[PDB]
């Protein structure tokens, strides 16, 4: 029914490993860039 | 430029304005002032300079007379080694849209008086140079940034 059965799951292994690696790395890079805004503080100082 | 220091050297002594806080000016005492003078205005940390039609020997003589007695302890001789100031890759944005024109200052950390690289950094700074709309040179100025400006 599906001769690709063996290679399909072999790919599924490679996929899951790569995907796990890349998702983590991209999460850091996102957090790294967004760190500027995430930590940013602001004040309201008129000549009141 | 005060804001620049306030964020570049944030959390250190260099982050403070020369004039000081409003609260400090409000509440500074004669004791506090006299303390500063006695603590800082000390002979080894002072330089009597002169320039003109002045004989150097006559200068050190009048200096020898009015610049006074020797310090007693070793503490009063030694020149203080200031604690280091930490640079911070950071920004401070004080926004006021009612303000006519905007001011922007951007800087990296320098080397210090001792470093011979300070000469090259002045050569580099000379390349870019400076400009304001009264520079008669106009579009023909050698400075690329000025020409684009
Ligand atoms: C973000 C998604 C990344 C998925 C990466 C999948 C890489 C699959 O790579 C494939 O693996 C097969 C199994 O060995 C091989 O037969 C193929 O030649 C190879 O191209």
Q: Kindly provide the b/e burial profile for residues B51-84, where b requires at least 16 CB atoms within 10 angstroms of the residue's own CB.
A: eeeeeeeeeeeeeeeeeeeeeeeeeeeeeeeeee
Secondary structure of residue B121 in the 3-state scheme: helix
Ligand 1 centroid–CA A25 distance in Å is 19
> Which two three-digit tokens encode residue A18?
């790569």
> Is A11 close to ligand 1, i.e. is its CB under 6 Å away?
yes
Q: Whose CA is nearest to atom 9 of ligand 1?
A: A11
SS (H, E, C) B55-120: CHHHHHHHHHHHCCCCCCCCCCCCCCCCCCCCCCCCCCCCCCCCCCCCCCCCCCCCCCCCCCHHHH
Count of all residues that appear for chain B in the document: 149
> Is A16 close to ligand 1, i.e. is its CB under 6 Å away?
no
Give dist(CA A3, CA A6) in Å, integer.
7
Ligand 1 centroid–CA A22 distance in Å is 14
> Which two three-digit tokens encode residue B28?
């500074």
Q: What is the resolution of this structure in A?
A: 3.2
The dihedral region occupied by B141, where left means phi > 0, alpha psi between -120 and 50, and beta the remainder, is: beta
Q: Which of B11, B143, B24 is nearest to B83 (CA)?
A: B11
> Is A9 close to ligand 1, i.e. is its CB under 6 Å away?
no
Choose one of A6, A13, A14, A26 to mutate for the ligand 1 pocket test, by most ligand atoms within 8 angstroms of C-beta: A14
Give dist(CA B45, CA B78) in Å, integer.
9
Q: Which of B2, B23, B4, B31 is nearest to B90 (CA)?
A: B4
Ligand 1 centroid–CA A24 distance in Å is 19
Contacts of A36 (CB under 8 A, 6+ apart): none
> Is A23 close to ligand 1, i.e. is its CB under 6 Å away?
no
Ligand 1 centroid–CA A11 distance in Å is 5
Give yes or no for a contact between B4 and B87, defined as CB atoms under 8 angstroms apart: no
Provide the experimental method for this PDB entry. Answer: X-ray
Ligand 1 centroid–CA A14 distance in Å is 6
Give yes or no for a contact between B131 and B141, defined as CB atoms under 8 angstroms apart: yes
All structural domains of chain A: 4-48 (1.20.5.100)
Q: Which of B39, B49, B102 is nearest to B76 (CA)?
A: B39
> Is A20 close to ligand 1, i.e. is its CB under 6 Å away?
no
Give yes or no for a contact between B17 and B2, defined as CB atoms under 8 angstroms apart: yes
> Is A10 close to ligand 1, i.e. is its CB under 6 Å away?
yes
Give dist(CA B44, CA B71) in Å, integer.
10
Give dist(CA B48, CA B67) in Å, integer.
9
């Amino acid at each position: 029914a599906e001769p690709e059965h063996d290679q399909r799951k072999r790919m599924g292994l490679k996929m899951l490993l790569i995907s796990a690696l890349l998702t983590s790395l991209l999460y850091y890079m996102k957090r790294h860039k967004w760190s500027v805004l995430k930590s940013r503080k602001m004040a309201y100082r008129p000549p009141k | 430029f005060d804001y620049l220091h306030a964020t570049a050297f944030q959390g250190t002594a260099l982050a403070r304005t020369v004039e000081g806080t409003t609260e400090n000016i409000k509440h500074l005492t004669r004791a506090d002032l006299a303390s500063y003078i006695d603590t800082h205005f000390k002979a080894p940390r002072m330089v009597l300079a002169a320039a003109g039609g002045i004989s150097h020997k006559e200068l050190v003589d009048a200096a020898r007379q009015h610049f006074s007695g020797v310090s007693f302890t070793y503490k009063e001789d030694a020149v203080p080694i200031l604690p280091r100031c930490r640079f911070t890759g950071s920004e401070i944005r004080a926004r006021d849209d009612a303000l006519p024109v905007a001011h922007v200052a951007l800087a990296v950390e320098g080397p210090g008086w001792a470093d011979p690289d300070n000469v090259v950094l002045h050569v580099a700074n000379a390349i870019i140079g400076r400009y304001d709309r009264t520079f008669g040179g106009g579009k023909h100025l050698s400075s690329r940034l000025a020409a684009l400006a």
